[PDB]
Symmetry: D2
Subunit: 201 residues, 4 copies
């Protein structure tokens, strides 16, 4: 297949007590899998459309592709953006640390803005720290669903899933507690790597 | 400031009779300029939100940034994606040509899918040929407005503005004639350059 | 103020085993309450904008109003659309029954279309049976979030909340089981009343 | 057919010099017609879906229905909301006038809010004065495209088409001039009638 479901870089319960293993299992094995299957299906139907010269469902297929592929991209980044507490730095350092200071003033300012963007979403969405190639800077974006409210070319550095399935079983309606806990498992090494590769294509 | 209005790489009337100089002037001098100002303003507002430590308008600011920055990105690519009729090959060649045949079967198949995506938009939008870094392939996407219906990380290679201001004064409601005429001014050399740089990340 | 949180017309656990009392409490006391407060706040903000004669945040305020008021409307109908198992007929009768057969062919056909609309949503949303005043017919609509994908003037007759918070704690990712169980608690008497009042405008 | 294209209640050039007859002709004969045809088609495909028990394209069909029907509803109201200058009151009076004063403070405040909502739209959209049945009041809403950003049950009283095709040929990018001119042709008698019938189902 074109798209494949990546394995978690750690055990399902490795992020506890911050993120329950029950959520990690359903989230990865069920939800992420659906997006991979959906993205592959969209490509197959588009191929069939070209073959038969029948583009009647083009609007449906283009949304299916965007929604599912965006879901696949977002979650693939999401898994790697996390690591068990103690297995990675508690704060960004070196180049990444300096860059965050440059575009946000301080790490605390970045956290406050990222958190506000995460908890204020009206509907399903993502809080995202991205590299803007046309501006050469790091900005925060608030995705709607998976594929809305973002410029083309945006390179994801750090992302937080704010869809209810990502926190409801453990935190219920208190999304704030979820975000506070989540900061404890952010793998700053992964973010730093993405940054190094992002600012150069 | 952070974002600037790029100048056109050709005269305003260089794309005639395909696209009128009148549209080119309004589109570039009025419309594109507004997105640059809007994107800069969004960043300024976000900075002020950080200083005052008040993110009450975070939802508005993130949408202002996404909408305006996406408008800026989309039009910047759009201008370079075109060139006077005989200034570039009417058909893709070399690496780009082979890539199109690989992912679409043929150039004609690609044109058919791109055209269908462009003319079927329900509202304002864009037809886009992008490089998918995850699947390592070229896909067509149908953007809604400027910032919706696309996966993060999508690298724009070729884009067509389907907002009414882009064709109404010349083609009125007949979107089909606009798209047909547009193919004549596509700068495949620019698209090839974007493909080369995107493929190496 | 202008909007108030309506009380449930039954006990929190009256819809068990179909919908857990735990979900009913969180859904009504926490989620619905937030939309009431948000809708009232949006109106207050708009009034202040009028006094100060500054509409700089008009885009944010109009979305806050639409999102929150739609959330309030949708849930208000939702609560009344349900009732304890044997408190109402398991199948529509009289005028409503005839109307369903007229616009859908049969009750089963209506259920099939409504269910497909409910389970196929890409993101948060609602499956809705509405009265179309213009066409004078009953149609099914698929709302995105609370306020998108619907014509103005649509009168809600029967609605099903497909946001993850509505079923996740009990049914997890299996949307299908949630919808199947929900049909057992539909209050057709409430739906019939809404139809009668909507048809006479 | 279920939906039909209503005729204009006046000549195509009756609204000049405020709105050109050239725009009125394309807008009504071409654009509005497309929405009626689209709405009818959506219903036919939904009927076919139920017959064959094939709801694979349900997401596409529900959006096609919402987009086209909303477009039909919005324009049907739009045509009647206008009348040649001098043929109707320059201001709202009696019940409507008092209601506007009640929910906006004054006619001037309502105009300022409505205008701000009209010119600030990010993408295609509508500025709308609606009757809120769950609140018993008149509010202003900002529709995105035709079917987004509005609560179910909203009854349109006065609407302004802010899609570029509605003003571009005459006003180009200056949407402000279009809105200023438009106020001269508002048929307050039509709005008053809709209000009388709206506040009572
Ligand atoms: Fe998720
Ligand atoms: Fe444009
Ligand atoms: Fe809900
Ligand atoms: Fe229109």
């Amino acid at each position: 297949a074109v798209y494949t479901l990546p394995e978690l870089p750690y055990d399902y319960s490795a992020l506890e007590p911050y993120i329950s293993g029950e959520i990690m299992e359903l989230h990865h094995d069920k939800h992420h899998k659906a997006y991979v299957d959906g993205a592959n299906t969209a490509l197959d139907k588009l191929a069939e459309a070209r073959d038969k010269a029948d583009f009647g469902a083009i609007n449906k297929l283009e949304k299916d592709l965007a929604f599912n592929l965006a879901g696949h991209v977002n979650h693939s980044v999401f898994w790697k953006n996390m690591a068990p507490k103690g297995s990675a730095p508690e704060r960004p350092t070196d180049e990444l640390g300096a860059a965050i200071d440059e575009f946000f003033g301080s790490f605390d300012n970045m956290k406050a803005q990222f958190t506000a963007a995460a908890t204020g979403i009206q509907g399903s969405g993502w809080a995202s720290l991205v590299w803007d190639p046309l501006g050469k800077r790091i900005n925060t974006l608030q995705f709607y669903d998976h594929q809305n409210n973002l410029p083309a070319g945006s390179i994801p550095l750090l992302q937080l899933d704010m869809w209810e399935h990502a926190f409801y079983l453990q935190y219920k309606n208190v999304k704030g507690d979820y975000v506070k806990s989540w900061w404890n498992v952010v793998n700053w090494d992964d973010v730093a790597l993405r940054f190094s590769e992002a600012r150069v294509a």
